[PDB]
Amino acid sequence: GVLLESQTKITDGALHFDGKKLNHNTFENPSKSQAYDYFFGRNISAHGDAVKPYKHFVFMTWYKGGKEERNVMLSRFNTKTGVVKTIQFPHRHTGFRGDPLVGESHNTIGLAVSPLNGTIHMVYDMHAYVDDDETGRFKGRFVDDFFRYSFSVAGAADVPDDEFTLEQFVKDTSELSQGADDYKHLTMTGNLQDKENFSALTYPKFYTSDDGELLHYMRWGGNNNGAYYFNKYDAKNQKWTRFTPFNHKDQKTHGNAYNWGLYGQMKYINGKLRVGFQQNSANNDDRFKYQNGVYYAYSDHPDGLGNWKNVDGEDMTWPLVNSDEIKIFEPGDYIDHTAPNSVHIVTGFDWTVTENDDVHFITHVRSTDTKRSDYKEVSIHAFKPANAVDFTITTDFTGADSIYTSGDSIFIIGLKNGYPFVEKAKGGSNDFEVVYQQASGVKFDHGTIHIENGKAYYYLMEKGAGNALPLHLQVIDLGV
Numbered sequence: 001g002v003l004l005e006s007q008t009k010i011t012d013g014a015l016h017f018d019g020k021k022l023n024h025n026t027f028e029n030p031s032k033s034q035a036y037d038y039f040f041g042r043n044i045s046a047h048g049d050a051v052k053p054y055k056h057f058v059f060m061t062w063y064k065g066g067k068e069e070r071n072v073m074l075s076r077f078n079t080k081t082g083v084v085k086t087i088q089f090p091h092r093h094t095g096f097r098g099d100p101l102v103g104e105s106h107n108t109i110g111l112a113v114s115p116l117n118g119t120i121h122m123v124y125d126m127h128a129y130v131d132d133d134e135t136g137r138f139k140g141r142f143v144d145d146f147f148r149y150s151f152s153v154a155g156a157a158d159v160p161d162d163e164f165t166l167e168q169f170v171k172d173t174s175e176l177s178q179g180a181d182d183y184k185h186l187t188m189t190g191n192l193q194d195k196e197n198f199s200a201l202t203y204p205k206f207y208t209s210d211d212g213e214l215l216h217y218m219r220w221g222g223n224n225n226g227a228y229y230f231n232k233y234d235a236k237n238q239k240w241t242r243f244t245p246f247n248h249k250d251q252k253t254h255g256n257a258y259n260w261g262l263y264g265q266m267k268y269i270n271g272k273l274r275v276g277f278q279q280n281s282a283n284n285d286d287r288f289k290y291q292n293g294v295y296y297a298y299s300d301h302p303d304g305l306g307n308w309k310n311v312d313g314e315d316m317t318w319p320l321v322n323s324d325e326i327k328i329f330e331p332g333d334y335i336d337h338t339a340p341n342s343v344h345i346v347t348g349f350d351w352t353v354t355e356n357d358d359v360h361f362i363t364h365v366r367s368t369d370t371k372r373s374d375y376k377e378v379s380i381h382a383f384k385p386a387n388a389v390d391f392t393i394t395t396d397f398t399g400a401d402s403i404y405t406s407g408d409s410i411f412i413i414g415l416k417n418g419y420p421f422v423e424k425a426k427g428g429s430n431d432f433e434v435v436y437q438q439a440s441g442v443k444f445d446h447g448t449i450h451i452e453n454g455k456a457y458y459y460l461m462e463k464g465a466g467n468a469l470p471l472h473l474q475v476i477d478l479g480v
């Protein structure tokens with residue numbers, strides 16, 4: 001029953017890093033040519049939490065194309081009329097550590113629209129930025145601008161197409177305003193005293209609760225010392241709460257044997273705030289070069305403020321200090337190496353929970369040393385049916401980067417030879433089948449997905465040369 005219901009071009013020129021990959025030794029001599037060099041990956045548009053359906057619209061964010069442009073953009077697509085109206089913001093992608101010549105793929109444009117009062121929310125262009133000066137890592141380039149929040153008056157999301165302009169959005173008019181085209185707010189609470197609470201964050205991601213409340217979470221910190229922080233939109237007062245931690249930072253000072261970072265996602269699923277991740281311990285003497293384990297917890301509090309529990313319903317220390325409390329299993333156990341740093345876990349992790357409360361995790365493990373003779377590589381699917389005691393754990397699985405769910409089913413959705421495909425399985429099972437594979441039309445380089453209404457919103461960038469490429473929105477019915 002899977003089928004493409006619409007494909008809609010949004011622009012001919014969104015930003016893309018088409019230049020050379022830089023590193024620690026080279027990033028300070030980026031090309032001044034027409035090619036746009038980058039430091040991590042090439043993707044920045046149609047990337048991250050950049051697509052949201054709201055009533056009969058779909059809102060999308062992107063970076064204006066052209067190495068020399070880079071403006072934050074917001075588009076609203078009218079599903080009934082076919083009209084795509086775009087707003088161009090003044091802020092331009094500031095690049096790796098604030099140098100626009102080096103593309104920075106972390107700095108996505110997160111987006112949300114409040115069902116309660118029709119305000120629009122955007123957090124963007126952020127990668128652990130703090131206040132510092134000429135001698136710091138960031139050379140003073142983010143002072144009074146390390147958290148970048150833009151948002152509209154009430155009702156902006158429903159205004160006629162002629163009124164959907166930058167005039168719908170609220171200026172920074174505080175003591176720290178950088179001027180007349182300052183649309184970036186340093187906090188979401190409206191109180192600059194809260195500013196340290198918004199420092200050093202990455203990865204803006206929004207959810208809507210079952211009662212229409214906007215939730216938001218970001219990641220503080222780095223590789224082996226990080227935390228998830230989450231907050232809530234007060235639509236009545238048109239402001240957000242301060243950020244609250246899922247786990248403590250600097251766990252080793254809060255009672256843990258080691259500091260650890262997190263690689264995973266918080267998600268609002270089945271009407272609860274939940275988290276699934278692999279940890280990255282600061283210990284460099286054990287067998288895991290980077291990540292290890294699979295962890296999961298959920299909150300019985302509507303806003304996540306306490307009452308956390310692990311998969312077995314046991315109370316979790318909160319904010320969490322010791323990840324052991326919520327560990328499900330060790331992907332490391334599926335490879336035989338035990339020597340220090342011999343086990344490599346980074347890509348291929350995600351998780352989901354079905355409407356029937358089937359819990360699913362996917363992961364990937366390989367030998368650190370790819371040249372060894374007994375090299376090993378497995379993909380893992382760990383899943384527990386609703387009415388099951390234990391998890392079923394299998395390496396009879398091809399691997400994936402994401403897992404999705406809708407209704408009774410789980411899905412794997414991505415690109416194969418430039419075209420979207422969908423694989424589907426019953427919730428609580430490992431029985432995946434390809435049920436959809438686009439086979440004609442322009443091909444795509446990358447994209448990002450949002451599931452809702454039994455549909456996948458696949459926000460995509462078309463393949464091509466240069467650093468200004470077209471964007472298309474595909475709406476795919478999953479047919480559940």
Ligand SMILES: C[C@@H]1O[C@@H](O)[C@H](O)[C@H](OS(=O)(=O)O)[C@H]1O[C@@H]1O[C@H](C(=O)O)[C@@H](O[C@@H]2O[C@@H](C)[C@H](O[C@@H]3OC(C(=O)O)=C[C@H](O)[C@H]3O)[C@@H](OS(=O)(=O)O)[C@H]2O)[C@H](O)[C@H]1O
Nearest residue numbers: 039040041042097104105106107127128202221222223347
């Ligand atoms: C957290 C670190 O803290 C300090 O070291 C410092 O602030 C540093 O950032 S820095 O100032 O720029 O150097 C931070 O180090 C990077 O942090 C990233 C993070 O988790 O925030 C890490 O990026 C994640 O993992 C990357 C591997 C991923 O990159 C994609 O995947 C791969 C690959 O698998 O080989 C290659 C490409 O880099 C890219 O396509 C990141 O993706 S993202 O799209 O850029 O967001 C991200 O998931 C990063 O590895 C740290 O070194």
Ligand SMILES: [Ca+2]
Nearest residue numbers: 172182184185
């Ligand atoms: Ca500002």
Ligand SMILES: [Ca+2]
Nearest residue numbers: 283284288289
């Ligand atoms: Ca380690």
